């Protein structure tokens, strides 16, 4: 009934502020300057940038923001799949297709939890510590100035829903619970799992905005943008892999990306 | 394959 639902929605909850360390609660305080805490240094150019390296972690710029990017993905990666086994009934699936479902989620919740932490001007990193401008990431020379900007785009529009951290953690629990991913060999207790997932997700969102209304439909809609952003991702990786030398995939990435859309 | 993610999936 009601109560399970009820139920659902707070483990999850309470599973989302352990695995992910930045919610979208202390983001926005740090985007608004509503908080007391100090403020984060600005990479707005090339210079602000080298003036940065003291505040964030490890030849030319595009490169090195490029493999410090893929830094916080492989550490993204580890946080969302620490949150997936903590979905009921996730363990308890063939390793298989929790492999699967992991390979073709984590970019798309990537991408959703990233939203947490942009706004129209740019996007925080290293924990809220940061601040990159959208303007410096366009400015990046191509392909890597292409990077960045449709994950700023999905973000305006997907941040106008104002979900809290309580609705996330369970629309990003029904985005890994997706039973059409390719190969996946048993389909069946994915769906039973994401149907109990999408009613706790529909119960939560009438409950915690009532005077939003079909929050739960629209929200829908947007899981297929995800899927497009995570295509037109990995095409933008396919042609890196090929017109630039002097850098290497983390192998974690490797194994998401090889043979995926 | 997908070393990584079954050693994160058993840790």
Same mark, same amino acid.
């Given at each position: ?11 999850? $909850? ?5 695995? %992910?360390? =930045? ?32 505040? *964030?972690?490890?030849?030319? +710029? ?8 893929? $830094? ?17 009934? %996730?363990?308890? =699936?063939? !390793?298989?297709? &929790?492999?699967? #479902? ?8 990537? $991408? ?34 292409? %990077? ?5 785009? %999905? ?7 104002? !979900? ?10 029904? *985005? ?21 997932? #999408? @009613? ?20 829908? &809609? ?5 899927? @497009? ?5 990995? &095409?933008?990786? &396919? +042609? ?13 990435? @490797?194994?998401? $990306?090889?043979?995926?859309? | /394959?997908?070393?990584?993610?079954? /050693?994160?999936?058993?840790?």
């Amino acid at each position: 009934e009601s109560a399970d639902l009820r139920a659902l929605a707070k483990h999850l $909850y309470d599973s989302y502020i352990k695995s %992910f360390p =930045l919610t979208k609660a202390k983001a926005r305080a740090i985007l608004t300057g509503k908080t007391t805490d100090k403020s984060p240094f600005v990479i707005y150019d090339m210079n602000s940038l080298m003036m940065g390296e003291d505040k *964030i972690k490890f030849k030319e +710029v595009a490169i090195r923001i490029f493999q410090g990017c893929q $830094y916080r993905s492989v550490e993204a990666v580890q946080e969302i799949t620490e949150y997936a086994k903590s979905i009921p009934g %996730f363990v308890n =699936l063939d !390793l298989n297709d &929790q492999v699967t #479902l992991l390979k073709y989620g984590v970019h798309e919740i990537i $991408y959703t939890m990233l939203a947490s932490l942009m706004n129209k001007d740019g996007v925080l990193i290293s924990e809220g510590q940061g601040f990159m401008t959208r303007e410096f990431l366009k400015s990046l020379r191509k392909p890597f100035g292409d %990077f960045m900007e449709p994950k700023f785009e %999905f973000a305006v529009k997907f941040n106008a829903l104002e !979900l809290d951290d309580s609705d996330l953690a369970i629309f990003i629990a029904v *985005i890994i619970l997706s039973g059409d991913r390719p190969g996946l060999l048993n389909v069946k207790p994915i769906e039973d799992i994401q149907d109990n997932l #999408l @009613q706790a997700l529909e119960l939560q969102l009438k409950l915690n905005h009532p005077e939003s209304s079909q929050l739960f439909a629209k929200l829908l &809609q947007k899981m297929t943008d995800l899927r @497009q952003i995570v295509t037109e991702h990995v &095409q933008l990786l &396919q +042609v890196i892999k090929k017109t630039e030398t002097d850098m290497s995939l983390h192998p974690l990435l @490797q194994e998401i $990306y090889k043979d995926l859309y | /394959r997908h070393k990584i993610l079954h /050693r994160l999936l058993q840790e």
